[PDB]
């Protein structure tokens, strides 16, 4: 449902743990490589917690594997993203997504 391909390594030691908030930057693209969203465009890190349905499942399972400082490409099947529906005006139906995600820090 999610493949993780590292772009730049993290420290390999500091992973998200229960009660912590992940602070990330991301860019989301479709399979054709075209961007549909990026926190870097608005220069606003995205904060979320694991275990609360705060993100699509591909992020839930992918970012949980990342360590602080890591930049990774997450390739997410529709089951782990927006499935047959998509997201109105942004993501088409049945869309495999590619996110470039950087774990900036844990809070
Ligand atoms: C009150 C709600 C506002 C609230 C919005 C924010 C905290 C802002 C946050 C940065 C999201 C971005 O705002 C510019 C947008 O980012 C994307 O462009 C993106 O790149 C993108 O894919 N993501 C953003 C970065 C993480 C991975 C992923 C993600 O998981 O996004 C959450 C989301 C829409 C989950 C669905 C939720 C329902 C559930 O059933 C579905 O299961 C199939 C999944 C999103 C964090 C959600 O949990 C919280 C919200 N939702 N608003 C909604 C749904 O309208 C997606 C396509 C759309 C997002 O705007 C809604």
Residue numbers in the entry: 1 to 107
From the paper:
FKBP12 proteins are members of the FKBP PPIase (peptidyl-prolyl isomerase) superfamily and catalyze the cis-trans isomerization of proline imidic peptide bonds. The immunosuppressants first bind to their respective immunophilins, FKBP12 (12-kDa FK506 binding protein) and CypA (cyclophilin A), which subsequently bind to calcineurin in a groove between the CnA and CnB subunits. The immunophilin-immunosuppressant complexes inhibit calcineurin serine-threonine phosphatase activity, blocking the dephosphorylation of downstream targets, such as the human nuclear transcription factor NFAT (nuclear factor of activated T cells), involved in T-cell activation and interleukin-2 transcription, and the fungal transcription factor Crz1 (NFAT homolog), implicated in virulence, stress response, and thermotolerance. To this end, we characterized high-resolution structures of the Mucor circinelloides FKBP12 bound to FK506 and of the Aspergillus fumigatus, M. circinelloides, and human FKBP12 proteins bound to the FK506 analog APX879, which exhibits enhanced selectivity for fungal pathogens.
